[model samples]
Target: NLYFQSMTLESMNPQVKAVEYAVRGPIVLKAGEIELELQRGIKKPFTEVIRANPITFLRQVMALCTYPNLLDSPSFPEDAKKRARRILQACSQGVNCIREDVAAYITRRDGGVPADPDNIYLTTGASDGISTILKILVSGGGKSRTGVMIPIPQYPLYSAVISELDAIQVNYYLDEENCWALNVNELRRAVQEAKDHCDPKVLCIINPGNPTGQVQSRKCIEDVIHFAWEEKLFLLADEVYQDNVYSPDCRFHSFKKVLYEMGPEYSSNVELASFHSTSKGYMGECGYRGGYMEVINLHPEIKGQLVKLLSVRLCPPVSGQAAMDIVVNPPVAGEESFEQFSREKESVLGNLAKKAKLTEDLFNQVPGIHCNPLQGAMYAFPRIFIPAKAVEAAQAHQMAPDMFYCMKLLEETGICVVPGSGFGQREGTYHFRMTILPPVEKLKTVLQKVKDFHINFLEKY
Candidate 1:
């Protein structure tokens, strides 16, 4: 025991990897503070303006795990009670049916993923899955080092998990001008550089990305596969937003599909692990903790390691798994839930498409805000051309350029959004990622507030 205490873990120069999360950044935190201040009778400007703001509204919708007002059904309470009993019974034994259901559903989604019932391992949430994968993959030494390459402006979950797992994180730039496209050259460059220090084994690709919301093209996918093949890299495809394609010209191409199209050399041989989640798409089931990852072409030994690793954790939430199953495989054409499910699915997706367009349009109307049309997903990543006055204001007030503008906007009009640097930025670029989840009217108002704030900031700077 004295010998163990004499040796410290830090002596090993241990390293971990992490993914970045910008969704609930300073803006959201400020919103919470504002809510508390309002409760305390603080009379800040714009306090009343966002008393019941649409951002809050959308968040509420997201928290509900499904469409708003769904629990109002006459049979819901009784059905929920019955489901609870069934879930309790299922949990008594180690074996669970929910994982299989979720897997079967994804298998049929025809999203070009080879999700199988036997291989599906449920976790607390996508966060759990991300962390588990990182831990398992990085469980070796020296040449066994694992590094994951991710887009510069990635969701914080990946960064957090990687950091905790002591894995390496390599950043690759996304082409902002090309609608947040992945530059294969940049990817290769990042990989090569990472290889110099780490094993650089896994390359993470977030299609229809989080902050940027850009869908990948088929050609781009193909190029990525060839690059991985040449480099002998494993692929981590995060396709939670697979169904969120909104642009008419852009399409959602699955990595698995692209690999298969590449034929046996890539499809049958490449070690790829792809993920899907209920938090995205039309489900908005973020709170449900529902999702799955399909592992393809990994050696049997690694598969066995994964299975043992997952089994120790028991299982994910039964209800969330059930909900995911419903999502992946809805009622058929003649079933009662079929028409309703179909309508809800289409309605949610349709609204997302409209909001994506609306956000881009409103942002573009502002003189200094140049927005790339949303190709897919539920965000508008816009470049804000800060005037000299704003830059000066940032200096005078001691803040980053985008931070100064965003803070001023929030203080003046109560619209909340994260700064571009929080996600990432090019050498000389400034921008922000705003969620289009707000209803049409609220989004328009938010955009107007931002425009007004930009004008005032410019004058002050």
Candidate 2:
């Protein structure tokens, strides 16, 4: 049932063995110590951010949101249930596959385009989609000539896949001070610089970004599209958070929408591929693994190439496709589920908006901290000013500046956050990415702990 290579396997450097696990890092261990010390009457200005109240348990929390598993009833419509039953019946007879309606929806709703049904492909998740696309792109060459220009401070999935494909990972900076806005000058610089060493054929834009949470102004979007058009690069839009806009100044605009708005010449000719998913927005059904992509402006031959590429993998999950359909076009008024669906969708988005605003206000009020208000998406990318001495010390310790600060915070307050270096930052700058998912009261505790941790860290610095 199993096989092994003739050669035996062994550690490459047994003498240099080091156990590495960030989840069990010294900081987390120190957090336990702090907890014990607190029980024994140890005094400190900081309190654990994790032990705060769980407002998610509120009786009215469901009325305030539509996150799956939060309500007594499922958020999706009865049509989803009927579809699921049909899928189960098919699968029982070993005929599991997506329906025509699901395929049509995928092709139409994805990237806000009315794509050809034959061109549509689905995936278990965007992760699967990302992997499949990269694998196909990397087949022509193993050289450093292939690279994707990902936004600096990107979601790690893109970087991870690039590493898997043995391709280069190029970065273009997003201006933090200017609401993490796209800097076309930076894009030009990055593209020109990367072109010398890599093919740099694709540009990935994560609108309403994950960590940065900045929605691009329409002008910025137009500029990016125009640049991609002129540069002859494939535009990859990650619009999974298209419905998560929270700021009055910012709004979600799909790549396809912008392309059409810019008129047909550019829209019809600008090789573009964009992604969307059901795991985000009001559903938050990450376990569902449902997503789809639409390719526009691609050569017809290459369009076939994309389809053939997915055909090799058989197909994406059918149930996931069903769920995605429900997400894209839910029940309308007069339908059995319409009333509840409307109310739940409104409440979920409304609560997310409130939480986004609240996180910004509270975090900004803390001493030695400054966080940009989250305009969209699910994260906050806060630019942290660390002391110069701490920077030097962090360098001496071979640690990134924000990594050092986060470690100290985790140890002192039991609040875990990803370091800025893991996402990205300028050479001398520091930042950290935090999810605003915690309940309002717990978030207050997170703010308090972060506040105290920074003051202590800065004082020590």
Candidate 3:
């Protein structure tokens, strides 16, 4: 059977096999299967799968891009025309940039810190942008192989790419007790230990971290920048959730802004690439896959080399580029669309704040459940106390304890969530990440169901 098979799983690259992305893996697939069953007259506690909604303006602008004829309609705004035309001009000319619109937008947002459009790369999504940069930096072999320092319980995209590129993954743990804050000491220890085996060149950071949802303070960002500079490591900042900050005390700070404020020495010397996306923010335009990254202090020769590399992929999606343009340059104060735009943006963000608070409070009420506040992103990662009997049961089934808990939760209550094991939590700790994206009433129902399920789960175990 093996000899007859043209490509067996065994014959594939071991590194590819080593990769495991838990977000859209077995559990998500099972959710889909259950959804299909419900459609076929089967019974379930929940009527439909929970999903995230995209912003209206993002969809409106994207409509203009795909159907240029929409411009003739009275329904279209002048702002849409201005943005769409700008994107078309740059794209039609076979240029990589939307006239450096991404850079200009970033420069304005980051408190007048100048950003060069020439350094910006419009990408399919923040994922594509991150993977492209990782691919470029990872090379050589043996002791010379590139190592990337990623935070533990990180977005799986970083881990998946590091394995795909065959680069070493050095994990630095976030302090769960301290509201999931990044520690300078942990970074130093990770880098020091990694130096023995490989060339650690890049440090990957996700602010308002995925799953954990902790927004970094300005001082934390400053310390990170200084550490990366002192270590001579290239910095990759994932700030896609910049506009999603919810905590009254926490404010999102761009690495670019912090780097510049550190003075000319760090700004001029530190090599950094900061990424943003249309997929997050008030506009959850994930399907459009629009995102951009601004790479600073890259060598001119190496920049040219990367251009050649990008050429192979030809260009990112034009529709995504158009979406990115609008995100960067949204309606201004005097613009016709300004009032309507601000209202909608505020509504989405305000609701998120409410849901975040509600989710945290409800989870904390449960005897065995503890959740961190949803500070910046659309998720609540709640830690759970799984009983020893349950852990033993999970081992009997050869599943992770958190995974077992989540799978049962889905089956019993029709509520779906990603396990903490997927995001790499501390050993022996159990947690699960559930999105706060659901509508208020629906989220209330889901939370109550989860509470009931957890209480029953505890008593049974």
Candidate 4:
């Protein structure tokens, strides 16, 4: 009984279907099913990014602004009230005030290097900011199609956006052997090879990388900036994980900061758009979709063009806008909410650091597994070795070996995660990315079971 419809899979938009986001792929779909099944009376297996708690100051301000009646509440701090009023008025006037707050945040984050309010675009999230930036950068047709150079094992947002826009996704492999560091030589190699087909015009950098949690060094960023400068490519820096660096020696460095530190030549010439959000930092409130991107060295005319493009979509949620405002302008010294706010931020980050290190240590202890230090970001991508029997079994089913591994892991242990195949990887490698967002005790239990599962799986194979 086939019914003719106005829109069917065959008749649907191809590019929309072309987008592949592995983070929510089939394994996760299974997890959703299992979760529902458990809720429906059939009880079984496991459980899940420990969702970071919302900052007290953020909620305080949110409540005050949301219900203006609450502005008189004695429980709400004076500082949060002050912040809320600033947001409330900004809502009435324009998001321009929030943009100014974003500008100030950037300025302070970059250590006195100023950011222009006009140059900041408050996005729905870092995702919105990235896609919008790519929207403008991607153009041309046929062989001249824009080639977006994204790191292998990237966040997949870059690839998904590039595919959706019909742009070429040019892969530049990160040095997985050396802690997944970016190599400029790899950049040069990928672009040079990509030139035969499409024009490589944009370079996407995830400083505190996603999936593969590498905190890129200042030297590496400088090298990348120089590469972009030489190639005349626009740089889109995903710094959403800016505050999530966990390794002792590692620190987050903005491409904008490094660009300025290199002096007028790189600062004035290299085009850069660095993004930030409430999603991945200590705040970690992704549901609000609060984020901003600071575009520097954009031509006045192009800036005008981006502004027009931005206006076409109107603006982000006002609630989310308030979130950004609260983030960038947090409680200062001597403020009523200062101590509480400070403690919350540190507590979240401290827990994350502990979990990250613990994850690295635990994974590395497994015989057939090797995980890079969880230097930054919330995910640990541990490279796993599959026995010949398992590899053969995956091929028989026409599945990626990594996918096969993750599927089995989910089925047996109820510990669901994504295959690194979803995030592109070098050929012949098998890995899975699980988050370091859980509590120490919870994550340790999860890790121990994974170890137990790995040993059994290998023996059975």
- Give me the runs in candidate 1 sitting further than 4 Å from their true place: 1-45, 48-100, 111-115, 139-144
State the lDDT of candidate 1 residue by residue for 1-461, as single tens digits. Answer: 01121323322223323333345545566777777877899887665435321122222222333432444544333333333334444541113565565555655564545555655665555556666666777755555568877787777678767777778888888888787888888887888787777888778888888888888889998999888888888788888888788887888777877887788878878888777777776555545666777667877877777778755544566656655554554455664345655676677667777888887887777788888878777777799898766777787877788877777677677776778877777856788778877787877777777777777776666
For 283-386, candidate 4 gives per-residue lDDT tens digits of: 66646768888889986756766877755554677878888888899887898888988898888888888898888888888899999888988888899998
Worst 10 residues of 2 by lDDT: 52-61
What's the CA error at residue 55 for candidate 4, in Å? 2.4
Candidate order, lDDT descending: 4, 3, 2, 1
Candidate 3 lowest-lDDT run of ten = 10-19
Model 1 poorest ten-residue lDDT run = 1-10
RMSD of each: 7.4, 7.6, 4.9, 4.7
Error of 3 at 104 (Å): 1.6
lDDT of 3 by residue, 363-456 (tens): 9989989997779887778999999999998888798999989888887887778889989988989999888878899889889999999999
Against the true structure, candidate 1 reaches a TM-score of 0.80
Using TM-score, rank the candidates from best to worst: 4, 3, 1, 2
**Runs in model 3 with CA error above 4 Å?**
1-59, 69-72, 92-99
Which candidate would rank higher by lDDT, 1 or 3? 3
**Model 4 pairs whose backbones collide:** none
How much lDDT does each candidate structure score? 0.69, 0.69, 0.82, 0.83
